[PDB]
Symmetry: C3
Subunit: 552 residues, 3 copies
């Protein structure tokens, strides 16, 4: 006969949603800097879990929603304490500059409440909305964009925009499983799964249509989607080599300080030096053409018996139709229709992209939270690596794939595709003959083999309160496990054997085959439908009986 | 001889004040919605405690203060993020409408800071305060009420006013005792006491004088007060049957949108269609008369040899003198003097109540936190159940009972009268012969009988931080108990016997009569004056002696 | 042979930084009142640690930074909810009063947005900044100070300024060591060290140059600095007797209420009664002279072969050059150059100090957080005890010591100099023969003697969240210790002996000399370089071996 033995520290887990504690490398004050969390562990302590085939589904990860919330929080914290520009949203009299930039004189307010001052600032034509009628050769009345929705907050000049890497290290009681399988798409079993303390750093790079400064495949071009048949889903295309992109603003501007109230200062653009050249961005022609030909071929493999054509964005307003790019705080909206202009036939010198620049943006597709970026003095040149594309298939011989974007969460999927967060369930039950490494690096081994890591495992056991909630819940779960072990007469031990027999039914396997060829994951899956009745049978009856008999 | 035995999980408790974790049924965004707390348990798991006579005192409950704070918090969270109406509080030129409503033209501000716009809105005469002199036949200057105190926040049109039930489920380590005794007044022993996880849902209905949509007695009319002799206390009268009340605003208004600044929009009343009819509310005459005759009789039983007369409110301003009623966000102030117009003689067709409506209110009797309710388009008809009355006895043959109100906490007492919050003290001490169900559903049983639930009991062991404080304190108390048991050499067990003898004095009862006829509540009360000396005698000396002797 | 024995509750500690839980005596609403923390323990339970020589360094204490943060938090909480005075910062037309006070007429705003009102208020010449050109005999234009930086918040009239004592009681798991050695400077070993639950009360008195209402030495004058050679450090001079200082404002003013917006009211000074007398403060001449002669002598002992001369502040603006003094909310800036006017020769009737008063201050040397103090009606007389001085030595026969100040943290050092915060490390390891009071009041005793307090010790195991972080971390550390003891097979006990031998190397001392002449502090210091290898040898191997052998 066999009796029930309770094992604490079993390398078994279940899928779970939980808040993660971010981390960054040591050393700041810039936008997206992580002053809200701990320094990183210089050695992630990655360990491979052998004979483990975890089913990953990147489209359902809670890490993407967590990252979105954390990025929004950091963004708002960065803008919150500075100038709200409520003295603006006044009538402007805009004249041609000596059609993208207008002179736009206005009065606003002065530092004293009793006076006004006639001032001027240059604005882009995309920020000013006409009033009355626009006279090509004369001054016309304008208002700033979003003055009918919300006054914009001025970016605070003391900080800059820099996508510092953010490391989400699993919180205690949870572990992050990293998929290291190559040519792995967004959904399906991963045959090379490791457990890490922390993820690789994720850069919160903001862009549309093209994925910049991300990770690249070591294999081939990877097409990721929830389903390719369903035309409403976004397709993330990962390249195995990057394409260099260099974006410039080939002009010079002078920053002017207009005092609009006590303390608060408005930073205006003016005194243009030289001619006004159009902003532009260069992508090498040969690399782009080879990249799109290979993407076409891979999609053709995914879409057989079809011609694949890249045309243009479907249409809409500027923020969706164009390629949003952040160059040192200067927000570019590039016209990419000249890049996605090709057809892939299954049977068979740089490109200059014209760009427009806006000072007033509505980031994250929110309404009423607009921000005004001050002009940045300097060369304003940014070089980045194009590592992937966002394509949307239109809803017949030829399939149409258009540039997409507008929902920033998909860009973070391009980096979080290899991670899953799981909850450790260290308490397991198994029959034994008697009657009475690190992290998860034992999973996949036999039940008998996983006898040493039982003690090593479980040694782990706005933003401020979420961090406390995570720590307090980890404490509460640990204490619940210790209380349950105490109730069973097992506290103080990691392995305890009790008096309840194992009379088959729960599992029809013998002692030797269970400890021999079964893993703890398989065992828990088989016993998952019995666990609560087993616990209830072990609970109270045996410990009350033993304590009462010992007392009397 | 007998020796001291320590029992953990004893069904004993003491009165305590603590923060509760609210709950609501699944599914919103409206005012008083509970987005701040957990879904409810579909089965409260009510269990009756036999042979338990808990002394209830509803007037000292901390649940009333907790509810008041939670309601204020939800109210402020609902109004906080929308329009502050600071462009108002301007001079208005008010003319007769083509005397309760005036045309009141004003300029306010426009969405651009440099312009003003002549606009008009209809206001009730109760909201506008005259300036200069009021000319019956001409335009006169007015200001809006509270412009000398605080600008009012506009109710945000995205939410409505709906008294969703709120379930306060006792937090871990505490339990709620529900009194199920009929014809039970606010203070005194309850002979049918049950323990619940959660209370019945409490609706945060706002009203004065009359208690609407509340609970009703299953017995007779119940008169509740701290003392009837003391004339400063409010008397809550509970009926055993409800009276239907139907309140209407028999007019139609058009909502106008006046843009006063970026984003923020003021919602004005205007374009009255048809004639202006006075708002009114109907109460059936026969039910009201029978209700007051029976209330009179019951008070006469409480006030013998007296004639009981219902006259009018004593006097004061509108907010206290009238009956405040919230109909889909439209705030009614009904004149109830025609209802409380009767005399009860110990020896022996609907009523129409005229009502006035205000848009600007000072809810909860606060100063500087006024709110402006926008006009609501529609039929505006509300039917409710009158379940109780608030009466105040005046300070001689005839006693005068006047309608009262003005302190919202008393309305919540009308629902919380049956609940008490107690703290569980699971650690108990009792002598034994040796030398070395659920919740609280064992209380009242003998000490020997309550030997099984020792293991079942203790398995339980702005708004965000209060919730963390409650959870952390529950954890800290649990750990203090476990540390104390460890110090005594008892951890890992629920029942432990130690070497300290019981040499009478602490209790003069024998082993058999203690385990036979005594309950744990009685035992703890008898030992309450000794517990700390007993603990000190058990603590340290015996465990240090045993560990030192075992070591050497 | 000897084997490793684990002792929990060892009176050993390490230096640590941690948040403290403040406390105050029972009973308010005033500025610096502590509504944010617990009532004090009426008996601090001070216990002297014999044969303990703790090395104190007041200049590196984290309690000073903690106090600074707590004082700033209380200050901001006190000013935050009242009037922001944004209607001010208007042009003023200032005429001579019928040169320190000017009539300064201005319009500001009225309670209604559509009207302005011509009003006047008297202001000090130090608060108004001239515009255009100042005409001695005519009205000139002025603006209020800080209107180019930030509008000032009006002190809320409902609260006053009172330096209530604040008791920082060590949080659980930490203890405060108080140095009771007399003639003890800021840095060095203290030979009379006691452990307390709480510190003496610290009064947050705000002043510069002179330390008021502080503690005084019971020995001699004490000179405290990080280094006297380095001329950039501040020198805190503690006297063994106080000097009485009486400061007055010998005038009368009428408070005027100017309504500037809804609710918010500006409190103006006006209607001066009688002549305008200069504010002044008296220090007795004989006590001051004796005090400075003795300070000179003590510094001469510290600076031998030098003449010590007290001259004047080096120079700078008013806020640094003068002596800042807070008299019932009226902020005085006294000219102390007449006091520090003497030379100490190593070989051998009250003083009236003229003072100026400001209404607008920039407290704590912050920029953009100015506060406007309303005039206070009354006698305005304050008497205080001068207990110490802040001197700065200039960078040659004669040394120059000038009054200093400007960094409030140094004043709190004058009170916190005797306290150090340490973390308790209750888990210790020692060899034994076998193979298998209160607070810290055992430190300094032998290892064998400290066998009783092992159980007594460890019984301890914006502002809201910091308090939760402290409590949660204390819980987490306790649980980590209990988990580690459980892993070793020791939980439930305070002293446990395991099977790992002690084969010298770790310590070359015998059992008897270790338990005989060694203390736990010395033992831990000697074993500090081995502790982690010892724990790893005890951990897992022995408990896994025992559980596996017992199971099979
Ligand atoms: C994909 O990844 C690339 C590579 O990181 C990224 O391009 C890089 O962007 C960063 C900014 O995010 C650029 O950093 C700036 O570089 C210029 C030029 O540096 C020259 O000199 C240094 C000297 O060491 C050389 O090493 C370098 O190679 C160049 O020769 C600097 O002048 C910039 O300084 C500003 O930022 C500093 C950050 O602390 C400040 O300390 C400094 O004072 C400057 O601040 C000024 O501007 C702020 C606004 O930005 C303002 O707030 C301040 O008040 C002040 O006025 C900065 O170091 C980096 O050079 C880029 N590299 C390349 C190769 O392009 C892409 O942008 C990224 N893709 C996307 C989409 O983000
Ligand atoms: C004591 O208890 C009674 C009973 O609950 C209570 O009266 C009830 O009050 C609620 C509101 O609190 C009333 O609910 C409204 O009912 C009308 C009419 O509904 C008709 O059609 C439905 C169709 O299913 C029928 O079932 C029903 O019987 C009627 O024939 C609705 O039109 C109202 O809709 C508004 O609220 C919805 C809530 O989500 C919105 O989704 C909807 O869009 C409407 O919102 C509009 O108004 C909002 C302001 O309120 C505004 O913010 C929105 O933007 C939008 O403009 C609503 O469902 C219910 O009918 C009442 N029942 C009776 C019998 O009177 C008493 O008030 C209560 N006593 C006290 C003192 O509170
Ligand atoms: C070093 O330490 C000394 C000693 O503590 C300190 O001087 C003292 O300062 C306090 C204020 O911080 C002074 O307290 C005020 O005293 C006056 C006069 O009191 C007379 O009458 C009482 C009657 O019991 C006698 O005991 C006393 O001896 C005097 O004869 C009071 O009138 C003051 O009352 C105000 O504050 C009260 C506090 O609650 C209020 O309740 C009261 O209504 C008054 O408030 C008014 O002023 C407020 C602004 O301050 C305003 O907000 C209110 O609305 C209202 O208008 C108060 O009790 C104490 O007398 C001083 N003692 C001496 C000997 O000088 C030094 O200041 C300190 N050094 C430093 C640098 O701080
Ligand atoms: C050491 O510190 C203590 C605590 O401040 C000093 O206070 C008391 O001194 C008397 C002297 O007769 C002792 O009897 C008391 O026991 C001391 N208090 C306590 C709590 O122990 C003590 O004087 C200091 N001793 C020295 C030498 O500085
Ligand atoms: C990666 O996943 C794919 C999915 O089909 C699988 O074919 C491939 O063998 C996996 N890689 C490894 C190394 O097992
Ligand atoms: C994984 O499976 C292989 C199969 O041969 C086995 O040799 C190896 O020991 C297993 N290891 C673990 C950790 O499961
Ligand atoms: C024994 O087998 C029966 C068959 O259904 C099952 O219900 C019961 O739980 C089993 N008991 C144990 C201890 O395995
Ligand atoms: C309810 O309380 C009253 C108080 O006097 C008591 O008389 C009555 O018997 C109680 N009800 C029951 C069922 O015991
Ligand atoms: C109610 O109406 C009656 C009618 O005469 C009037 O006397 C009484 O003052 C009114 N009360 C209120 C509060 O309007
Ligand atoms: C309650 O008292 C009655 C008295 O007859 C007894 O029979 C019953 O068992 C008791 N039950 C409890 C739970 O105290
Ligand atoms: C024994 O009786 C004495 C009498 O007062 C009492 O003080 C003492 O605490 C008792 N001891 C025990 C162990 O009950
Ligand atoms: C206080 O510290 C000084 C430092 O030199 C020392 O000389 C003195 O003896 C100490 N006091 C006592 C009582 O030991
Ligand atoms: C302190 O040292 C003295 C030295 O004679 C000794 O007598 C005393 O017992 C010691 N006490 C403690 C608590 O260390
Ligand atoms: C025994 O001595 C060796 C000598 O270095 C040391 O490394 C080892 O840790 C010691 N072991 C124990 C148990 O003290």
């Amino acid at each position: 006969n066999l009796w029930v033995t309770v094992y604490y520290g079993v390398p078994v887990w279940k899928d779970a949603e939980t808040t993660l504690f971010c981390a960054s490398d040591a050393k700041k004050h810039n936008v997206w800097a992580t002053h809200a969390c701990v320094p990183t562990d210089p050695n992630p302590q990655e360990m491979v879990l052998e004979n483990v085939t975890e089913n990953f589904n990147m489209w359902k990860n809670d890490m993407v929603e967590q990252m979105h919330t954390d990025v929004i929080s950091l963004w708002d914290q960065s803008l919150k304490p500075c100038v709200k520009l409520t003295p603006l949203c006044v009538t402007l009299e805009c004249r041609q500059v000596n059609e993208e930039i207008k002179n736009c004189s206005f009065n606003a307010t002065t530092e004293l409440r009793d006076k006004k001052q006639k001032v001027y600032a240059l604005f882009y034509r995309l920020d000013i909305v006409p009033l009355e009628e626009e006279r090509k050769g004369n001054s016309s009345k304008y208002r700033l964009i979003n003055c009918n929705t919300s006054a914009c907050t001025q970016a605070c000049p003391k900080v800059t925009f820099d996508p510092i890497p953010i490391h989400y290290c699993a919180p205690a009681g949870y572990a992050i499983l990293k998929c290291n399988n190559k040519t792995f798409n967004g959904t399906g079993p991963c045959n090379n799964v490791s457990t890490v303390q922390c993820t690789h750093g994720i850069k919160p790079v903001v862009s549309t249509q093209l994925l910049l400064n991300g990770s690249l495949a070591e294999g081939e071009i990877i097409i990721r989607s929830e389903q390719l048949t369903n035309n409403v889903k976004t397709i993330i295309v990962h390249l195995n080599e990057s394409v260099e992109i260099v974006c410039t603003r080939p002009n010079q501007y002078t920053r002017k300080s207009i005092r609009i109230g006590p303390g608060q200062t408005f930073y205006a653009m003016g005194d243009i030096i030289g001619n006004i050249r159009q902003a532009y961005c260069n992508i090498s022609k040969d690399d782009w053409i080879r990249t799109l030909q290979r993407v076409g071929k891979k999609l053709a493999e995914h879409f057989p018996r079809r011609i694949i054509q890249f045309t243009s964005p479907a249409g809409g307003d500027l923020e969706i139709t164009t390629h949003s790019f952040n160059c040192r705080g200067e927000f570019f909206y590039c016209n990419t229709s000249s890049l996605f202009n090709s057809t892939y036939n299954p049977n068979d010198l740089d490109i200059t992209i014209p760009c427009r620049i806006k000072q007033i943006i509505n980031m994250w597709q929110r309404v009423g939270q607009c921000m005004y970026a001050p002009p940045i003095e300097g060369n304003i040149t940014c070089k980045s690596n194009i590592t992937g594309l966002l394509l949307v298939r239109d809803g017949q011989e030829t399939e149409i794939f258009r540039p997409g974007g507008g929902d920033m969460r998909n860009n973070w999927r391009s980096e979080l595709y290899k991670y899953k967060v799981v909850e450790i369930k260290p308490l397991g039950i198994a029959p034994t003959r008697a009657k009475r490494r690190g992290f998860l690096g034992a999973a996949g081994s036999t039940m008998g083999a996983a006898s040493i890591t039982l003690t090593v495992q479980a040694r782990q056991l706005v933003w401020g309160i979420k961090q406390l909630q995570t720590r307090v819940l980890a404490i509460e779960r640990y204490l619940k496990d210790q209380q349950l072990l105490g109730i069973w007469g097992c506290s103080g031990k990691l392995i305890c054997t009790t008096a309840v027999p194992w009379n088959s039914s729960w599992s029809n396997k013998s002692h030797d085959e269970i400890w021999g060829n079964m893993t703890w994951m398989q065992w828990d899956r088989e016993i998952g439908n019995y666990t609560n009745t087993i616990y209830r049978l072990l609970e109270d009856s045996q410990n009350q009986q033993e304590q009462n008999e010992k007392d009397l």
